[PDB]
Structure 1
Amino acid sequence: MMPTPVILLKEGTDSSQGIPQLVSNISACQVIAEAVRTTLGPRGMDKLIVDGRGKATISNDGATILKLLDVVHPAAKTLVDIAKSQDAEVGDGTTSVTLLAAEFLKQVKPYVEEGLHPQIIIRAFRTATQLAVNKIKEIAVTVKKADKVEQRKLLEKCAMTALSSKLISQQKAFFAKMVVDAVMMLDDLLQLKMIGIKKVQGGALEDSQLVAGVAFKKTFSYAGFEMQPKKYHNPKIALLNVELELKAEKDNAEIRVHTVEDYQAIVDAEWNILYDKLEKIHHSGAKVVLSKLPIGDVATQYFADRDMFCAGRVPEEDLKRTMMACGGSIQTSVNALSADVLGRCQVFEETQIGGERYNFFTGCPKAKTCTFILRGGAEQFMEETERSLHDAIMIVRRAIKNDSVVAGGGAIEMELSKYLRDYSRTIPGKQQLLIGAYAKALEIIPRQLCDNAGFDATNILNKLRARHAQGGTWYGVDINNEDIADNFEAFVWEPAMVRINALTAASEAACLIVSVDETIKNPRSTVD
């Protein structure tokens, strides 16, 4: 190195090039994977992360843990990105993608150390991934019966498998049944915004309930609200986007009068405007009034005198859910409140749940919505319950899209490894080593399962390999029995697209990391 009186790049620029840079990238990826290794399988463990402000997040989802990890290593951020991608496209497998990518990089590290050209590794990864995806699509088990009970059972089993790694795994059957019930009453888009999730502190997990309708929290009642009845047996719900209170007619409106008679007339006109709106609401026959905009004390007292229920400042999402449940239409104007735009539910009732008041709309026969009311002993408990239910909901939605499943517990990946090794045995030999390394790396998930469970991973892997070699596709890891078992007959089912996306994303991440040869870091401006 020479001073070079006028330097080429900006002062402080840091560069790294060659094999050591790639080896460091692989090591960083391994470090990232080590942070979520233990959160895989029924015997997984939660992770607690504290931010700068001091709020603690307890989670088992790999994507959440990686997001909470403020990773700044350019090669390591690829694992976080692919975890986010798997969460977005599928919703489950965020740990598997990271483990697979890191294991791929670790397996090809010795070949990189001896100066193997990266493009050969990239081509081998592409070929192996294409073959694995084709094999998964070929051997995935699907039933062409279109039976309602059979598909319900399949969705329930998939949800149970997707839930048997979280803190709600003890009540996994109960939660899976509720999740399947909630998903099956969505119409065609399966929008997540159409499934409300309410968390109420205090109560056992089994106290959580699914509302065949809509339910939301009480919203800042005014004076005179306590005189309103809180139960109806055939109410008509008026869904409104209207501010029902005295106020200026317009922001730019100005009133100019020169007679006290005109003054009194103006005051009476304002009062008559509000009372005309209220009379139009009353004559519509509705007994429950819901408004996005605030509802004043005058309107609250008016509705109390007429024995009605009013609730202003209802959020947009809750109003839309109520529309989809009762079956009305949000009206920004009360001038045409026909019976067509009035929601209808069997029973409306306000009750107390864990020291809070919740308005309940139940008995809707044509509802297209739900509302999960989750009970727990802590805020993070409820947050993790919501995360687990979200994973289950995404899994059930994907299974609704297509009923193509493979046995979990590492059985699918053991079969893929066997097939890939058999394929690699019949090629020249430069790609054979790399494809064999890919197949060997595919074994990480059952090994990680055994390690988390406390098994001896070597014996379990040997037994699985011997079984798959002699036939038997769906033999995975029996966690309870300390042994192996046919996981398909044990109903350890997952959608095939989960593993397909996991393999695709892991392969793409590995190829992207391997392709990079030089890292350049410009100095950061505005050091402050």
Structure 2
Amino acid sequence: MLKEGAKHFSGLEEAVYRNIQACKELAQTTRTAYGPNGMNKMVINHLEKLFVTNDAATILRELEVQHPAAKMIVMASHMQEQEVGDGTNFVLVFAGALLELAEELLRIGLSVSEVIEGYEIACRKAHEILPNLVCCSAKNLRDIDEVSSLLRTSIMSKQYGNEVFLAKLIAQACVSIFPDSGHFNVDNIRVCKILGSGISSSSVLHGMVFKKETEGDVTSVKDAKIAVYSCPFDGMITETKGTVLIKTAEELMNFSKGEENLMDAQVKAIADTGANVVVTGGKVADMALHYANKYNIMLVRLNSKWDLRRLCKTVGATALPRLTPPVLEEMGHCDSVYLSEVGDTQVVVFKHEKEDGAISTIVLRGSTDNLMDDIERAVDDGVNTFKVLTRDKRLVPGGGATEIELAKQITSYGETCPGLEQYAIKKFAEAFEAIPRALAENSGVKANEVISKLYAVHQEGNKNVGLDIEAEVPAVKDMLEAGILDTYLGKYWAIKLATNAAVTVLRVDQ
């Protein structure tokens, strides 16, 4: 810059190249992040802790950038994830290679607004033909097989090797129970890792699953009022004082006698007010415990920050530490309170069932949490994939077979129009192409062997690649007619939100 003014981080080289180059590098790790994966991404964190994952939303929040073009798009990937489930892997990798094609139009001498409006015409026409590429629907969400048929693609988008057992097991853990007529738990589906009983022994436990060990006897009734407290019970140890190690031990005995009668009355006042279960986010006192067994009130030894807030939501309680004799302001909601041994661990089970107010919670059993916290990431987008808020989800070809189905239409539509928007419609059909080119390079063959066939097959909907030999040499894998499905809505937003982000980040030069 010629003068003292004009502080900016973009310009003639940097806006044309480096903004797209920054969006290239974020999309560089997402080349194999949707669909079949051999790709894995180890991360040490701002917590500096070792984790490997394949969800970009975990990766991109660890990633930081000063490029606002690179910074903006990961918010739009969240907007698809807030709306539908998996496909947040797709939003970055679609828009990333989209913008790389826009550089080539800027190599020729095309105006940016011609490139801006070029994908916009292509965005609308593709959204017209896209519901004509609806090939199925979830006609029976109560069926386990039709539910599991959708889920195998999103779990594959984390790992191909666990797509089939989990898609059954999630339907066995019943996202099926939601009619989806405005019914979807977002935190009463919260996946509960149980360490041990390795990952194929992961199980089903409807209603709220608490890993914390059940202390005392079981509740007096399953219809009990649930009292959820932040720290009602304590545990005593101390050290040297202002003058070291206080002058007597008599007041230590005098403070210990009232402490027992304090927690005697705390379990008594809960028993008086109607609540027959207490939730302790703090530790368990021994003097509190032996009166709780006679009062037949079930106790939880300890709870974390996430345990209380789900109870304050689902049951409807208020979390506060009771240094007073507690009264019921918590209004117990669940009519069934069980104890189960999941992973051979005392597991608190709360349960109630309603039409559009049910609870059904994913539980996992695996011998390693650092494996199982990534397996739940395959579950996390899969449950939100059920949130299409419709029974018939208008199922499209899974895997990415719709992309070559679309790309045939768009470059044909791009040829018919005139203009300099004319070229960017043709480059928009190329943006469908880049993802299976990047997936086939993880399959084990070149892209031109693969992408020749998927254009040559025809308008078919079925022909695609997995991670098999059929993916490699013939490039024909039934990613529609072998239990591999995707929905219309997740495909609709991920094309939409990647378009509006990439058009936005292209205009800026500052």
* TM-score when normalising by structure 2: 0.79
1:447 to 417, 422, 437: 437
* CA distance 1:344–1:512, shift in 2 (3 Å): closer
**Offset from partner CA, 1:471-527 (integer Å, 9 cap, x none):** 4233222542233144322232111122211211221222123212x23xxxxxxxx
Residue equivalent to 1:39: 33
**Offset from partner CA, 1:49-71 (integer Å, 9 cap, x none):** 22355312311012222222222
- Deviates further, 298-307 or 453-462: 298-307
| CA positional deviation for 1:460 | 2.0
1:404 to 372, 389, 394: 394
Q: How many residues end up aligned between the 2 structures?
A: 476
SS at match of 1:442: helix
Residue equivalent to 2:346: 358
Query: Over the residues paired in the alignment, what is the CA RMSD in angstroms?
Result: 3.8
**Offset from partner CA, 1:27-51 (integer Å, 9 cap, x none):** 3322222122133432331101223
| CA positional deviation for 1:128 | 0.2
Distance 2:62 2:494 in 1: 21
- Deviates further, 309-318 or 270-279: 270-279
**Counterpart code for 2:499:** S
| Greater share of strand | 1
**Counterpart code for 1:475:** K
1:299 to 288, 305, 318: 288
2:417 to 423, 427, 449: 427
1:240 to 2:239 alignment: no
**Counterpart code for 1:443:** E
Distance 2:333 2:117 in 1: 62
| CA positional deviation for 1:337 | 11
* CA distance 1:110–1:275, shift in 2 (3 Å): closer
2:384 to 378, 383, 394: 394
Distance 1:111 1:337 in 2: 65
1:121 to 115, 121, 125: 115
Residue equivalent to 1:260: none
Q: Which runs of 5+ in 2 are unaligned?
A: 235-255
Does the Cα contact within 8 Å between 1:92 and 1:498 map onto a contact in 2?
yes
**Counterpart code for 1:514:** L
Does the Cα contact within 8 Å between 1:155 and 1:399 map onto a contact in 2?
no
1:369 to 2:381 alignment: no
1:477 to 2:471 alignment: no
**Offset from partner CA, 1:236-259 (integer Å, 9 cap, x none):** 53412467679xxxxxxxxxxxxx
Distance 2:70 2:58 in 1: 16
1:348 to 2:342 alignment: no
**Counterpart code for 2:347:** N
Q: Which runs of 5+ in 1 are unaligned?
A: 247-266, 520-528
SS at match of 1:403: coil
* TM-score when normalising by structure 1: 0.77
Distance 2:111 2:306 in 1: 54
1:183 to 2:172 alignment: no
SS at match of 1:80: helix
Distance 2:220 2:273 in 1: 17
Does the Cα contact within 8 Å between 2:139 and 2:391 map onto a contact in 1?
no
2:372 to 374, 378, 382: 382
* CA distance 1:97–1:281, shift in 2 (3 Å): closer
Residue equivalent to 2:197: 203
Distance 2:9 2:300 in 1: 62
Residue equivalent to 1:505: 497
**Counterpart code for 2:430:** K
Distance 1:75 1:213 in 2: 42
**Offset from partner CA, 1:254-288 (integer Å, 9 cap, x none):** xxxxxxxxxxxxx9999999766645654788765
- Deviates further, 46-55 or 364-373: 364-373
**Counterpart code for 2:33:** T
Does the Cα contact within 8 Å between 1:46 and 1:59 map onto a contact in 2?
yes
1:192-271 maps to which residues of 2 (within 5 A)?
192-218=186-212, 228-229=216-217, 235-241=222-228
**Counterpart code for 2:292:** F
Residue equivalent to 2:242: none
| CA positional deviation for 1:157 | 0.8
SS at match of 1:386: helix
Distance 1:63 1:494 in 2: 20
Does the Cα contact within 8 Å between 1:407 and 1:491 map onto a contact in 2?
no
Does the Cα contact within 8 Å between 1:235 and 1:286 map onto a contact in 2?
no
Residue equivalent to 2:135: 141
Answer with 1 or 2: which has the greater Rg.
1
Residue equivalent to 2:79: 85
| CA positional deviation for 1:189 | 4.0
Does the Cα contact within 8 Å between 2:399 and 2:464 map onto a contact in 1?
yes
**Offset from partner CA, 1:339-393 (integer Å, 9 cap, x none):** x9585437435x4737xx4333277666822333323344431221121110111
Does the Cα contact within 8 Å between 1:93 and 1:498 map onto a contact in 2?
yes
**Counterpart code for 2:147:** L
**Offset from partner CA, 1:159-205 (integer Å, 9 cap, x none):** 112112334x4343332223234323357441311123222333310
* CA distance 1:382–1:146, shift in 2 (3 Å): closer
Does the Cα contact within 8 Å between 2:139 and 2:392 map onto a contact in 1?
no
**Counterpart code for 1:495:** T
Distance 1:495 1:21 in 2: 36
**Counterpart code for 1:71:** V
Residue equivalent to 2:488: 496
1:153 to 2:140 alignment: no
* CA distance 1:65–1:430, shift in 2 (3 Å): same
| CA positional deviation for 1:427 | 1.7
Does the Cα contact within 8 Å between 1:38 and 1:452 map onto a contact in 2?
yes
Distance 1:40 1:185 in 2: 27
Does the Cα contact within 8 Å between 1:66 and 1:80 map onto a contact in 2?
yes
Distance 2:45 2:265 in 1: 53
**Counterpart code for 2:462:** W
